[PDB]
Ligand binder design. Structure first.
Ligand code: 7QY
Ligand code: ZN
Length: 258
């Protein structure tokens, strides 16, 4: 599979190798704030990242992933719409060429500069590969980025990017605290969806925070210096690595807040 984000291999082409691209619960979606309904049944959201163990940062030619040790319940997401325990395995971002685009989810059609995805898997399925074959296998916590003041908790990530410029490069990335990427409020929207890259599996409970985080123009500029290509290949800047909004179809987006 040679999927990407260019004219010739981008989102509009994915359906040929991955027919689920036109399925019934695809992500991302536009979040219409005037349609999403407060759900009093949602339990409190619990982000328990105190024992998180980051390992490594990898440029995979699509984004960069910060990977965690998920061999035990060290960093978990629970509560909200979720039944049981979801283990943090990695986070990554999607971003734009310009500050007015980059997010995958949109809010009343507004695009943010970027979007952070913290990917977790349901521990009742034993491993990640099994979890992605289930409708309730993953929980992705999505956080919007806007350009304003610098995010201090992001700078350790920004500073390692020079060392993973091209596809297939990785670097040791220990002792990174993902709590420094969260906004103040955990108010969220939730809906059932999919992975936003191939293989596009319909296995995700999306939890999208309402409050964006602010990052500096300098921070996001350094994201944009990454490369999609491998070392020694013609430079293709890693920008606009986002899938656009997909049809909502027969789904409701629930709000955790009034
Ligand atoms: C096979 O299971 C997976 C799971 C998650 C991703 C990451 C995707 S899903 C998302 O929300 N954003 C992304 O980039 C994946 O990518 C190959 C593959
Ligand atoms: Zn993502």
């Amino acid at each position: 599979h040679h999927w990407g984000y260019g004219k010739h291999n981008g989102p509009e082409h994915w359906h040929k190798d991955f027919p689920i691209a036109k399925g019934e619960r695809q992500s991302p979606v536009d979040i219409d704030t005037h349609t999403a309904k407060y759900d009093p049944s949602l339990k409190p959201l619990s982000v328990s990242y105190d024992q998180a163990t980051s390992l490594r940062i990898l440029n995979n030619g699509h984004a960069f992933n910060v990977e965690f040790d998920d061999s035990q319940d060290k960093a978990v997401l629970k509560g909200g719409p979720l039944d049981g325990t979801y283990r943090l395995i990695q986070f990554h971002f999607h971003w734009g060429s310009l500050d007015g685009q980059g997010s995958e989810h949109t809010v009343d059609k507004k695009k943010y500069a970027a979007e952070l995805h913290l990917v977790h898997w349901n521990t009742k399925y034993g491993d990640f590969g099994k979890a992605v074959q289930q409708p309730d296998g993953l929980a992705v916590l999505g956080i919007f980025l806007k350009v304003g003041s610098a995010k201090p908790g992001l700078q350790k990530v920004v500073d390692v990017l020079d060392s993973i410029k091209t596809k297939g490069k990785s670097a040791d990335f220990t002792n990174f605290d993902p709590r420094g990427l969260l906004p103040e409020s955990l108010d969220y929207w939730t809906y059932p969806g999919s992975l936003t890259t191939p293989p596009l599996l319909e296995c995700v409970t999306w939890i999208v925070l309402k409050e964006p985080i602010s990052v500096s123009s300098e921070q996001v500029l350094k994201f944009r210096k990454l490369n999609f290509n491998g070392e020694g290949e013609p430079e293709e800047l890693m920008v606009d690595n986002w899938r656009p909004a997909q049809p909502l179809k027969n789904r409701q987006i629930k709000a955790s807040f009034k």
